[PDB]
Symmetry: C3
Subunit: 347 residues, 3 copies
């Protein structure tokens, strides 16, 4: 009970502690905030999962988070946002995916130089988008990370002498799918892989650890992540996608995030909003394959562009339904507290 939720008691106790422990807590919260989790223990679990997948990726992500938090402190950003990990969760993804999309293999120490540089731009993006989106009461999601990674991967490319990137080839021929070779076990295993591919990790154990951390933060968030991954798998099956792409979790890491965001987190949790979150996850998977095909023509991966776009689209949409409630941005903590607040406001 002490480690569940956002761990407000730990933050209150650390508010008067030496700044080193506070900085460590901020780094852990920023690591956890990729899946909309404000738990430092969930951040430790996510770090353990990243180390299980690849220690080099974990090192790059931790370095990116540290550099982003330090730069946000240097830029005199809001201290409340920095304490909650909202300044540094984009750079974790930036560093991890820069290590993922590198063509020079593991432990390429020179890659530590661009990573920091891009981690130097994550706060600025996070600032510049926020002051706009907070005008319309909308979150930035992973838009700063998407912009930074697209800019970096366009600047370097596959043929960069210093930091070559993994080549992205657009689909040229019609795939041949043997539907008799579809494996139910692999389809079931792609759900943890789908959840784990949020950090670009294809290890089923890493995805299971991520799901466990999310469940530690909030069981409803873990359930919505699993359902979003399953819906991404279903959308991939509906479009006759290659089985290797479905088994790799490339179809479920956007829909899982969309289901987490639209289910309980930024909309009050009701069965109507549950169905809306399911529909948003399906739409997010379809937009994900569309964006992947579109940016494959320019040599870029879609990453989490479809998730941000679809979630913003569904959040901006307005309905004359009292049971479909959009939570205020200042009261969004986690689905249980969000539902309690919505029930209190309803009466």
């Amino acid at each position: 009970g002490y480690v569940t939720g956002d761990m407000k008691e730990l933050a209150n106790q650390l508010k008067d502690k030496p700044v080193v422990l506070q900085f460590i807590d901020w780094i852990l919260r920023g690591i956890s905030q990729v899946v909309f989790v404000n738990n430092p223990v969930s951040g430790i679990l996510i770090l353990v999962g990243l180390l299980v997948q690849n220690p080099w990726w974990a090192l790059t992500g931790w370095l990116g988070t540290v550099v982003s938090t330090l730069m946000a402190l240097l830029l005199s950003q809001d201290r409340s946002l920095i304490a909650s990990g909202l300044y540094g969760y984009n750079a974790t993804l930036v560093g991890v995916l820069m290590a993922v999309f590198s063509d020079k293999g593991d432990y390429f120490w020179w890659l530590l130089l661009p990573v920091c540089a891009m981690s130097m731009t994550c706060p600025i993006f996070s600032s510049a988008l926020n002051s706009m989106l907070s005008k319309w009461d909308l979150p930035v999601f992973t838009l700063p990370f998407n912009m930074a990674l697209s800019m970096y991967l366009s600047a370097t490319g596959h043929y960069n002498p210093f930091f070559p990137a993994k080549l992205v080839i657009p689909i040229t021929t019609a795939p041949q799918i043997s539907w008799s070779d579809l494996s139910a076990l692999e389809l079931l295993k792609s759900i943890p892989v789908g959840v784990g591919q949020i950090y670009g990790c294809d290890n089923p154990w890493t995805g299971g650890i991520f799901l466990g951390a999310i469940l530690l933060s909030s069981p409803l968030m873990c359930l919505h992540a699993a359902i979003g991954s399953l819906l991404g798998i279903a959308a991939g099956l509906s479009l006759s996608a290659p089985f290797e792409d479905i088994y790799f979790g490339l179809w479920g890491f956007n829909s899982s995030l969309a289901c987490i965001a639209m289910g309980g987190m930024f909309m009050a949790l009701t069965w109507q909003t549950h169905l809306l979150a399911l529909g948003c996850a399906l739409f997010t998977a379809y937009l994900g394959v569309g964006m992947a095909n579109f940016m494959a023509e320019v040599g870029l991966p879609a990453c989490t562009w479809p998730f941000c776009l679809a979630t913003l689209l569904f959040l901006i949409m307005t309905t004359k339904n009292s049971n479909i409630y959009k939570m205020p941005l200042s009261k969004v903590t986690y689905p249980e507290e969000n539902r309690i607040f919505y029930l209190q406001a309803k009466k």
Copy 2:
């Protein structure tokens, strides 16, 4: 006189009728609203023209409109907008152009499955765009349809095992144009074809029927549609476009819409605004060829992206001219009533 204009008397009489007749009226108005027409009889005429061109395309468009209206009703959207056909006119285009850009020929019944799915997203897009564009008092035009069709055609592509799309090849060699083979009769005939290509129909009879329906709704709108198609033809001739592209109406279906919108419809009709509409039609044709060339590099058709972009750009532009008047979004019915309202407000 009873069937001209928006047919407000029919709506008033149907407001207390059984909901089946009201739903039929809403579907007809949504069909007609592609060309900014709120006339159910014009919707019937447009359906007849679509059947003349291709019954399969008409069936897909009708199914898309019905599904979009039902989904907008399910989402508790504004009943006034649904009654006027503003929730369902984008899905008509979505279904018709999904049938048009299909590589599996006519009467591919499986294509009825994705169409409905895309018609499920047309209301949401509209809503998500409306709440964004109503702040600055701007219409959504066919932006939801453009976004939905771009996402669908990127997701499927030409090499999809289930729903392949027609291949789009960027221009590779310089065209050889024999200017002695230019036909005045074909140039004149491309005006109805350019008007009918709004629905993706290249039949001159279909375009003539569409022009007749628009004239039934409003003569000024039909005149502006014809002038916009002619201006698109002129712009195509100015850039040495292939004659087959001009004869197919691919150059005049965006400028015609731009001239309809900017002439009398969303700006008060004056000779100054008439010249502004002509300039907007020329700019829209040039932006149309530019956007088509740009999106051919990613394997996508431009469709009505240039029309929406150019019309929004011309509507946002502000001048210190009293005779260049932008009609309020709540008072926009059709050019005759718009001009009457503008004359009343001027005095």
Copy 3:
């Protein structure tokens, strides 16, 4: 002292002169406003530099500026903006770069026809963006020019029978860089070339003349332009860019503009804002190579898209630092007056 700054005395004396002299002054100010300079004498110097580089390019730019100013007068835009050259500085770039990116060589008189047409659309863009951006207190920069040039170059392309454009080939193989062949003299000479490539001119004498004109307007702006060009060169060296691209000034014409804008011009000049301008110049160079690589896949040059995007991103970003001050849009004249106003407001 009479010709330094904006020469408000000359404007006051010309306010009651015949309109021909006023129009000439407006054209000169519009020519100079590309580098955020409101000096007609600097406009004359920039015209001299353009003539030194290429008389055809100077003729096209002058014609574009004249046409844009004439149509902005015809469109009843704000007279104060027209008098300060803010309606016509985008068409100077449009005409000059349309002459630059033409595949038909120099003195192609038919190119005078599209140029005017694009100069026709420059005021509208300048209007349409302004009303959108003045809400958030942001400048339009060269966004109208970028939009117009992208639209034109997409519409025509390399294979246009009438107005072919220079082919843009994306990078296909990894460059081989002989670092022992790097020349310090060429690196130093690329700074004036980097400043002169704002107008698409690769002549070092032209860049030196441009720097002299900027220094005549304001020494701080010239210093920031030189530092931005140097930072662009450094960023190009950091990414192992080909030496020919660095020597051609293709790496420094965006960072120089970003350093001019962010240093003293649109943000109050302090050492903190000086470091922020340096960081913005580095970010602008990296975004410039990224966007160049991105639009090379669609056959388009990036031009000044990265400069506008990065400068807007850095201007929107908000910090809780009193020394990092964003000047109001109505009081922005030049860095010396900007700093004086900021110092007066601080106390």
